[PDB]
Amino acid sequence: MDALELLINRRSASRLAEPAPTGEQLQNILRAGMRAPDHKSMQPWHFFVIEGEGRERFSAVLEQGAIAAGSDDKAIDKARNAPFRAPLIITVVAKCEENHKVPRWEQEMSAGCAVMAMQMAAVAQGFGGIWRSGALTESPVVREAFGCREQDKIVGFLYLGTPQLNVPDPTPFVTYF
């Protein structure tokens, strides 16, 4: 696939199904993430691969987090069922470290860019996915499940799988200095 094409036509897919990326195709996605912009080369991030059985555990953690958050049954139910919307979910956590001419937000930024890079790496390989977050990224139980320290932050839950689904116009968003 052409790189420029990938970027200009990039799209997120929410309707995902098996097969999910695996073997080298999955490692290629993880490798793309490692190439995200990174101020001072701090590699401020960690990836969690959630497939098959993992989804069950991930389900339980999210439901627990919702309960603890004081969410109503409707919310708790949506949380418990969240993981089963894709065959694979990659959680991205920004692993930050005290300033280094690099404020915390920039380190979190790099981790974020990693999520997009991986989403694109899935597309480049015949797969697809969508970057999701939600209030549960701030849940203590959820954070603990992904080893979040005080300065760490869950930047996204990347849902991936085989998708089953006019030229962009940037003029309204551009100004010539």
Ligand X SMILES: Cc1cc2nc3c(=O)[nH]c(=O)nc-3n(C[C@H](O)[C@H](O)[C@H](O)COP(=O)(O)O)c2cc1C
Residues of this chain that bind ligand X (CB under 6 A)? 11-12, 37-39, 41, 106, 109-110, 113, 130-134, 156
Q: Which of 62, 79, 155, 160 binds a copy of itself (CB under 8 A)?
A: 155
**Exposure letters 122-132 (e unless 16+ CB within 10 A, then b):** bbbbebbbbbb
Q: Does 10 bind a copy of itself (CB under 8 A)?
A: yes
Compute CA distances 36 → 83, 106, 107, whole Å: 25, 12, 11
Measured CA to CA, the distance from residue 5 to residue 13 in angstroms comes to 17
Site string for a copy of itself, 108-127 (x = CB under 8 A): xx--xx-xxx-xxx-xxx--
Measured CA to CA, the distance from residue 56 to residue 145 in angstroms comes to 13
Amino acid at 166: N
Q: Does 4 bind a copy of itself (CB under 8 A)?
A: yes
Residues engaged in binding a copy of itself (CB under 8 A): 1-12, 27-28, 30-37, 39, 43, 45-51, 54, 57-58, 91, 105-106, 108-109, 112-113, 115-117, 119-121, 123-125, 131, 133, 147, 155, 167-170, 173-177
